[PDB]
Amino acid sequence: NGQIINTYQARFGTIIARNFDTIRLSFQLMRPPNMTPAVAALFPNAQPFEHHATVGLTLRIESAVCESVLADASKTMLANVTSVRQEYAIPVGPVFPPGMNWTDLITNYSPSREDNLQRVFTVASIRSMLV
Amino acid sequence: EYIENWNLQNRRQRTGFTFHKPNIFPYSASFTLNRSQPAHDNLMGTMWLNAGSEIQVAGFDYSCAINAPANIQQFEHIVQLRRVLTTATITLLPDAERFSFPRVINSADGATTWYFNPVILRPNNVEVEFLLNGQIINTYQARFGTIIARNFDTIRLSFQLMRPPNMTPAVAALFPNAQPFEHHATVGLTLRIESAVCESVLADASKTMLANVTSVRQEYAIPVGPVFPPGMNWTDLITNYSPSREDNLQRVFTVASIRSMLV
Amino acid sequence: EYIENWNLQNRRQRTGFTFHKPNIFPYSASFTLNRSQPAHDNLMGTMWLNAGSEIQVAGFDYSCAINAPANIQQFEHIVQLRRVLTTATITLLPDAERFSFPRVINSADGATTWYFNPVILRPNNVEVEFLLNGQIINTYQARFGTIIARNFDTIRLSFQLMRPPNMTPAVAALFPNAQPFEHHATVGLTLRIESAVCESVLADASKTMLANVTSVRQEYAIPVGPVFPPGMNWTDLITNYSPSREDNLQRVFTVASIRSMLV
Amino acid sequence: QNYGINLPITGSMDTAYANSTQEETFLTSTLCLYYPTEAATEINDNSWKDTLSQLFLTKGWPTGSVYFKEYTDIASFSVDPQLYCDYNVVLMKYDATLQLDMSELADLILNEWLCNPMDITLYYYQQTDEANKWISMGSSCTIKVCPLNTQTLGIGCLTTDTATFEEVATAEKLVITDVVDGVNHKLDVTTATCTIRNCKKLGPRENVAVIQVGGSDVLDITADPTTAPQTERMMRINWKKWWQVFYTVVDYVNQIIQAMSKRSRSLNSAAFYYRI
Amino acid sequence: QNYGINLPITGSMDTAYANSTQEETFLTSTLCLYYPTEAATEINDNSWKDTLSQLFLTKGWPTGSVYFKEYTDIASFSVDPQLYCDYNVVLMKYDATLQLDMSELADLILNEWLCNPMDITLYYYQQTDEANKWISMGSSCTIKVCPLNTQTLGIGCLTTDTATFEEVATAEKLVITDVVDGVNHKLDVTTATCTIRNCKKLGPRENVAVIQVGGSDVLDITADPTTAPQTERMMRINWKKWWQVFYTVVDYVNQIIQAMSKRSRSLNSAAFYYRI
Amino acid sequence: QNYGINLPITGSMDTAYANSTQEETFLTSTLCLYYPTEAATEINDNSWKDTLSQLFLTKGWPTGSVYFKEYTDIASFSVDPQLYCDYNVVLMKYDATLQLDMSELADLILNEWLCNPMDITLYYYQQTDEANKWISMGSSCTIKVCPLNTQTLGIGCLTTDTATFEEVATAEKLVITDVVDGVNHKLDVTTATCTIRNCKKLGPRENVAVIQVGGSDVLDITADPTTAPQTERMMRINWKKWWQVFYTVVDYVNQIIQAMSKRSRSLNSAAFYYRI
Amino acid sequence: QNYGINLPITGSMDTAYANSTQEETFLTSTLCLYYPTEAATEINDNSWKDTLSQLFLTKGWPTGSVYFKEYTDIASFSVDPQLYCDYNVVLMKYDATLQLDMSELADLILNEWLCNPMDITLYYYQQTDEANKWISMGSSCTIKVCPLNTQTLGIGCLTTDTATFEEVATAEKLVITDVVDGVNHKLDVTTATCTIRNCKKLGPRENVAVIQVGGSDVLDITADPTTAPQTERMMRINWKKWWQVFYTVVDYVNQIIQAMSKRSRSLNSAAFYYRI
C-alpha cells in the first residue's frame, strides 16, 4: 500500500518478503572508471555505439502465501477447470475470459472473478480427490 | 440499510448500498494535448472535469479537422471507477457547458498560459461504453438522455469532431484553411450518474455519514491516523480507496448511521 | 422525523432536520462594482447568483489586474445564512459557468446597460471559510470537490484574479496594458450544498412540505395572513425568517407531513 | 455628496430598464462640430450653419445647442485644442503625409491626460511607466533628447553640447514624445515657441469622437507597437463632397452620440478626484 | 412558398450532416468573373478565357459554366451594373482617388435594393428611414438638394434659384445620396443624362463578392459613420501581375463560393428591384 | 530524450503559475533588430548602436546580446534573408507601390517554409495542396508558366515556345507563385539569375516580428483571398523620426517579445522533426 | 511533441510488424545525387538526367522526386555545402592527396553541428568539450593559433606578433580545427576570405550518405585518434567509368536509402545550425 515493508540493498540469493503487493527494483549502470584496452574499445566517447551497456536483474518467487487463489507450478486446479471447460465446449460466460486464459484473468482479477475462481478451484480440488 | 449490509457482508452475501449521485469520481480538472507546440495556437486535445457523480469532457481542435483524415478528429476519454457500480442511471447530454467559454489555461508544466476560444459543434459518432474487466457490458451510440449501466467499473466516452461538409458564410469564416485559428472547434459530453448501487460505501449527495465522521474528527481535533488522509478529504480517500481504507470507512459509516438514529 | 422534531422541540431538546439540497439562500442575482465609470469600460467587481442550495460567484477585472499592487485582484463574497447549518456536504468547483459568457447588464440604477465579455482565468488563492458567530469553524484553501462544513452560519469565499506572469502571444494579445479592454478577466467559484442538517425547517429538493402548504393555500384562495409572504413565496419567507415565521412554518410543515401520510 | 472616496455600488441583475434618455440628453446637452476651413470653402454658403442647426432641430436638438467651430488644418488645430461642448465631434481630413500628426491629435483629444509642468532648464526628467509621455505644443516644437546614465553623463551625447542631442521633434505644432522609461534625459526644447508637459494617460475621453474623412484606418492612439485599437469613437467615412459629410453627420447623430458618453471628469461626481 | 413563409421551421440539433454539396453546386451553377479592361490588356492573350475555363474545369466547374465579363473602369461599370449568373465575382482595381466610388459600387452590388422612380421635376422627396437612400446613375449625375420647411420654404436655398441649392454630386456615374430624414427636399438633377431613384436597402446580397485588387481596407458599404463592416464577401489581395490574380481566383474559387450563398440571384440581372 | 515521437501531454489545472521567465529569457537570449539604411542615415550618429545597446541593458538585455543588422531596402532584404537571433524584429518601411513585395517578404519571414529543389528544365511541376507555393529569390526572377492538360500539352501555350507562356513575375528579387493546384506547369525561369524552390508552408515562425513603419494595414501573408490575418507579430507604427521609432521599440521590447515565441522548430525537441 | 519529448515510450515486444513503408517513402520523398563535374564530363550526354530519372521511376521514385546537383571538386563543395532534399547521396571521387579534405567534408555533412560566430578579432576562444571544434570555410582559410596561459601570455607565441603563431591551416576551403581543451587561444584568420565558427557535434546525420568512388577506407569522421568508425552511410565503390557508377547507385537505391533515416532533413539546406 505504498509503504516500504522490506528493503534489500546489494543482496543476492534468497531473500524474504514478509508482506507486499508491489516490487520496486532500482539499479544503475555505472560506467567503469578504469577500463582495459578492450573494454575502452567497446565504449567510445561518441556515436556510433556498436556495443550497448546493459545491467539486469532476475527475481524469482519460489514460494509465497496469498489470501486468494492463484495458479502455481505445483497444483492442477487451473488446469482441471480449463480442461473441463474445453472438453465440453462451454461457451464463454460473463465472468472469466475466453478459454480461461490466465494472463487475462490475473490482469483483471476482480472481486467477482476472485469469488468465482475460488469456487471453481475448490470444486476442482474436491473432484481431484476422486478423479 | 447500513447495518443490514454489515450483517450480509459478515455472512458474505451481496451487500448493496444505493446512492443518489454517488461520489465516485475524485475531483480532477485536467487536460490532454495530443497536438501542441510552444505558441499554443494550434492545439488538439481534451479537457475534462471528473467531479463527484459528474463527468464533463470536451475534445477541441484548433484547426477544426481541416487536415484530419476524412475531416474527422477522434477523441477518447477513459475513466476508471475505483469500485464497480451496478443498476446505475446515467444522464448523457451532448454538450459540456464547463468547457464552452473563453478560457486562459495554465501550461502543463505551469511555465506559461494558453488561450481557448471554443466554438461548440455537436459531438459526432458518440459512443458511451460501460466496461467491466475490459469487456463491454453496455454500449450507447448517439443516445442521449437517460441510459442504464447495469454493471461496470470503467467508462469510455468516444466522440468525434466532424468538420461540417457544408457551411454558411458566417460558419465558413470561423474555420480557415491554415493558421491563425481564432475560433477553436469543440465537441463535448456530459455524463451524470443520478443513482447507482455499489457493494462498497461511498459519499453521496443525500447522506450525511461522511459529513458526520468528518465533523466528529474536526470538532475533537483527532490527529491524523495511519489509514485516512488528513481531514477525511474525500478526493484523497477515493483516489486511493484501498481495502483497509474501505473496511475502516464502512466501520465508521455504520457507526455514524447508528449515531444518527439518536443524535 | 417531523413529529420527532416537534416532540424534541416541545421539550427543548436539540432538534435536527436533514435536508438534501437545502433551500437556504434567497434568490438574488446581483453585482457589485468596486471600480466603475459612466461608460463601463474599466470595471472591477463581483457578480453572483445565490439560489436555493447554490452560490455562483465571479470576480471580474476589465484591466486584468495590470495596475494591481502585485498583479493580484482580490475578490470576497460573504453570504450570511438565515439559519445555522451543520453536518453540511458541499461541492466546491473552480469556475462559475453562469458568469462566463457575454452579457448585457443593467446598470445599478437601470439608467443604462453595460457589456460583459468574460475570459475565464483560474481562481487564485481560493479560501472558503465557514464561520459561526464570526469565528472560523472550517477553512479550505485551494481545495475543490467535496468538503464538509460541520457547523456554520456564514460563508466567506475569497479568491484572486492573478495576472499570468507568462503568456503565449494570444493570451498576451487578450490583455493589453491600457484601455480599451475587449476581453475581461473573470475568476469564478461554484458552491453547492448537497446535504445539511438544520435545527429549523427549510424547503429542500426532496421533501414536499412547502409545495403541500402552498398548494393547499392556493387551492382554497386563503387570504394573505400577517405571518407569511402573500404567495407562500419562499424567497420572501427565507429572507425574513423571523422566529414567528419559523414557529408557524414548523407547525404547518409538521401538519403537512401528517397529511401526506394519508393524502 | 461623498466626493473624495470611491464607494462600491451594488446592483441587482434583474431590476428594470429606464426609458430612453436620448431625447432629454439632446434637449439638455450641447454638440460641437470641428471641421477644416476647406470644408467651409467648398460649401461656399453663408447661412450653412443655420441650415445645419435647423436639420439638427429636426433630430431633436434645441436651437443654439449645436455649435460649429472652424480650424484651419490638423496641425494648427493640434495646438492646445479646447473641446468645451458636452459632445464633441471632430471631422479630421485624412492626409497620407500627416499620419503621425493625426495620430498625435487623436491621442491628445480621444484620451484623458493629466499634465504637470516641465522645466527642462532646472531638472532632468524620466518617464516612470507606460502611461507617461511628454506632450509638447506650440507654434513650433523642436525637442532634442540626451539620455543620461546612472552617473548623469550622457549616452551618445554631452550634456553641455546640445549639438549631440538626439532630435525627436522638429518644428512640430504638437508632438507626444515617448522615451525609454527609468532613464534620466536632458531635454532641449524651443521654449520660446513651445511648451512641454509631463503627461499621464488616465484613460479614454468619452465625450470626444473623431470622424476621419478620407483614406484608410491609420490612427494609432496607443504608443505601444503591439496594439492599435480602433475604438467606437474613431469613425471613418469615404467622401467626395462636404455637404454629404455634414448630412451624414446630422442624419446619424444618434449613433455618433451613442458611441460617446458624458465626460466622466466633467460632472459633479468627478469633484475632488481631479476636476468637477 | 409564399403562403408558408410565415410558418415555423423546427429542426433537431442531432440531425446528421448531409454530404458536401459543393460538387453539385458547381455542376449546376454558373460563375461570372468581372475584371477591368486593364487586366485583359496586361495579360495580352486572346485564348486566356479558354485557359481559365479549363482551369476551372480542373477545379470542378463544367465547361460553359464560367463566364467572363469585361468593364472599362469603376465609373463605367457603376452605370446600372448587371449581375448575370448564380455567382458573381467582381475584381475591382483599387485607386486611392476613387474610394467613395468603390464604396458606392460595392454598396450597390453587395446589398439588395428596392427602388422607385423619383419625379424630381414635380414632387419633393424625403428619406423616411435609415435604410432609405437616393441612388442615381447614368452618363453624368449632378444632384443639387434644397431642404425645405413646413411651409415649403427652402432652408439656406431659394426654391426657384437652383444656383443656391446644395451640391452633393458632380458628373458622377453613380452616387448614393443620404439626406436628413423627415425633411422634404427639392432636387435638381441632370435627368437628361442620369436617372435618380428612391431606394431602400433590403439586406445583403450573397451571390455577389467583390475582390479588391491592391490597396487597403477602404470600402464602407454602410452610410452609418459608426459602422464600416467588412463582410466575408469583401476580399482584398495584393498584386503585381494580373495572371497571378486570376490564378489566385481560380485556385481559391471554393473558398470564394463558400463566402457566397445560393438563392440570392433574382430573375433579372439588374442591380435592384424596380417598382413603377 | 524521446525524439521523433509525439507523446501526449496530460497537464492539469491548479498547478500554479510559475514566476515570470521574461528576465531569464532576456538574460539568455539574443535580439536582432533589422532596419533600413535610411534609418541610420536619418539618425546620423556613429554611436547610436552603443546607445541602443545601453538602453536595452536598462530593460534587462545583457550587453552584447542585441544585434543591429542593416539592409538597404525591402527588395535587397528579400534575397533570402537569414534571421538567426533568438528574437528578430524587422523594421520595414511602408511604400504604397511595394504592397505585394512587402506582403511576400512578411509571408516569407513570418512563416515556416519547407523547401525542396526545383529543376524546371527536367520536370514539370504542380502545387499539390493549398500550402504548396513556388518561392523564387535572387538578383532578378522572371517566371513564366505554361499550364498543361492530361495530354501533357500546353493550355493557351506551346511547350516548345516560351514566348507564349504566361508571365507571373518580372525582375522580382522575391516572388511567391500560387498556381492552380493539380495542374502540371512547364516553367521558364531565369535560373542563371535566381533560384526557385517548391515550398510547403508548415506554419507560423514565432521568433520573427515585423513592425511596419508608417502606412496602413496592407500586408497579406496568406494566398487565400478570403483571409487577411493580422497576427500579433505584425505591428504598425506611425512615424516621423527614426529616433522615436527606436525608442518605442526599446521601451516596448517587453510587449514585442511577448508577441513572439521561441522558434518551435529551432530547439532540442524538434530534433528529428526537421532540425536540431 | 516538444512538451512530451521528456516522456517515456513503451512498446510490447510482440506487436505485429507494419507493412513495408519503402514504397510510401519513395512516393513522398525527394532524392539528391551530388556528383563531381568530371562525372558529367565523362558521361558526355545532355539528356542523362532524364535517363536517370526514368530509371529511378522504374525503381519506384515518382518523376520530379530525384534531383541532380553538380559540384566542381571536393574543395569547392566544402564551402558551405547545401543539402537540399530528404535523401542526399554524395558521390565523392577519391584522391590520395586530399584524404584530410574528404574526411573533413564527410565529418561536416554526416554529422549534426551547432555553430556560433567567433569574433577572433576581439575575444580569445576555448574548445570546452571533445564535441567542440572550430569549423572554418570560405575562399581561403588560414588559421594561426596562439595558446595562452592564466595570465593571457601566449605559449611559444607572442600575442602581438602573429608571425610567431602556430599554423593549423593554409588556403583551406574547409578545415575543422581541434585544439587542446581548457586553454584560451588567440586566433588569426583571413576573415575577409573565410568565416570561422565555434561548433559542437550534436550527433550523426541520417539523411546524408557519402559514396567514395575508388580508393580505400580512408575517411576519419571523428577527431579521436583511437576511433575511425565506418558507419552504414559511408559507402565505397570501385570504378572505371561513371555510367557504371550511376547505374550502381540507381540499382541499389533501396539499399542506400535503407542505410539512411527519415526526419533528419532540416528546413534549411545548410550544413549546420547557426546561433548568433
Ligand SMILES: *[C@@H]1O[C@H](CO)[C@@H](O)[C@H](O)[C@H]1NC(C)=O
Ligand atoms: C416610460 O415609458 C412608458 C412606456 O411608453 C410610459 O408609459 C411612461 O410614462 C414613461 N415614463 C416613466 C417615468 O416610466
Ligand SMILES: *[C@@H]1O[C@H](CO)[C@@H](O)[C@H](O)[C@H]1NC(C)=O
Ligand atoms: C454520402 O456519402 C456517403 C459516404 O461516402 C455515401 O455512402 C452516400 O451514398 C452519400 N450520399 C448520401 C445521399 O448520403
Ligand SMILES: *[C@@H]1O[C@H](CO)[C@@H](O)[C@H](O)[C@H]1NC(C)=O
Ligand atoms: C517566485 O516569486 C515569488 C514572489 O514574487 C518569490 O518569493 C519566490 O522566491 C520566487 N521563486 C519561486 C521559486 O517561487
Ligand SMILES: *[C@@H]1O[C@H](CO)[C@@H](O)[C@H](O)[C@H]1NC(C)=O
Ligand atoms: C498490409 O499488407 C497486407 C498483406 O498484403 C494487406 O492485407 C494489408 O491491407 C496491408 N495494409 C495494412 C495497413 O495492413
Ligand SMILES: [Ca+2]
Ligand atoms: Ca549624439
Ligand SMILES: [Ca+2]
Ligand atoms: Ca506632430
Ligand SMILES: [Ca+2]
Ligand atoms: Ca516611455
Ligand SMILES: [Ca+2]
Ligand atoms: Ca500603437
Ligand SMILES: [Ca+2]
Ligand atoms: Ca460616385
Ligand SMILES: [Ca+2]
Ligand atoms: Ca445655399
Ligand SMILES: [Ca+2]
Ligand atoms: Ca437619410
Ligand SMILES: [Ca+2]
Ligand atoms: Ca459607414
Ligand SMILES: [Ca+2]
Ligand atoms: Ca516581389
Ligand SMILES: [Ca+2]
Ligand atoms: Ca499564351
Ligand SMILES: [Ca+2]
Ligand atoms: Ca496552388
Ligand SMILES: [Ca+2]
Ligand atoms: Ca490573403
